[PDB]
Amino acid sequence: DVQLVESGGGLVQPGGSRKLSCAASGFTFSNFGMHWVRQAPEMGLEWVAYISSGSTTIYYGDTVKGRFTISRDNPKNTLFLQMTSLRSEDTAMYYCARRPLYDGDYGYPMDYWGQGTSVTVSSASTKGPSVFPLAPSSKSTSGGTAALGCLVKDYFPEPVTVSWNSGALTSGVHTFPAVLQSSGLYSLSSVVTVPSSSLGTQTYICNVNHKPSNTKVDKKVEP
């Protein structure tokens, strides 16, 4: 099937530059126009740039014109967004999206979006999280249910990605929205509820990935 995967995000100081990539598979890339769209909580969804299949037509959003350059490598099935003179307001999740063929004839809008790659613009320095277990105990049990988790403390910038058992465990997981600490560093917890009868035989590992600090940590949470 169709697959779009963005990469290259991270932390950039104001005035700096960064190049994002979007790898396409599952279709004939060279036949389709492509878009970059970005999203920030205060921004909503905001179209950034368009490049036609043969790069003959290129359009830019008003607030990025002159700083951002969209391009593509059709042989390598890749779309690019070069960002320059980055500003605080460029902080956002960046998505690539496919433009279906001939929307003047059939009317299909941008239809396949990637998962996005995050960009934060600030002068603060990156810092990777410390990961601590939230161990199940008699104080975290109720009627045959046990709660356990991982505390992911003191990192910058957002986001951190948390999985359990390398993505095999998802049911009952609650990964909380991060809080901002007075230090300017973020912290969150990820918890799950499981059978208390499971604690002696099952293995529960939280996988924490913080790309801006190249931090990858696996924490086994033991009773």
Partner: protein, 113 residues
């Protein structure tokens, strides 16, 4: 007052020709300007013709839009070549004296032909 004609919707790269007809107290000597307004954006001068017929254009339309006048009718024309989506707006004639405006839309759809 003034009346604008010629607005419409065209696919990118297209051509439109606006006209602005003057009536009553309007003197040709006062000159004329074509202005443009997009939603939530500030009114922008697009092109101007003086009483002496000197022309001036916003940098965003230089090389694409031209302005001219039929002196005897006091009718001012905006020829718009190579239209782009960003040219979408309501276009007003001004001398000040304003007009009702005429809508210009530039689409950016793709066809199989």
């Amino acid at each position: 007052q003034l009346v604008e004609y010629g607005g419409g919707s065209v696919q990118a790269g297209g051509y439109l020709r606006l006209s602005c007809v003057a009536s009553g107290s309007i003197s040709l000597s006062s000159g004329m300007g074509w202005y443009r307004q997009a939603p939530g954006k500030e009114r922008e001068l697009v092109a101007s013709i003086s009483g002496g017929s000197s022309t001036n254009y916003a940098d965003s339309v230089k090389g694409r839009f031209t302005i001219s006048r039929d002196n005897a009718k006091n009718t001012v024309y905006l020829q718009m070549n190579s239209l782009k989506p960003e040219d979408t707006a309501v276009y007003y004639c001004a001398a000040a004296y304003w007009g009702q405006g005429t809508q210009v839309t530039v689409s950016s759809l793709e066809h199989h032909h």
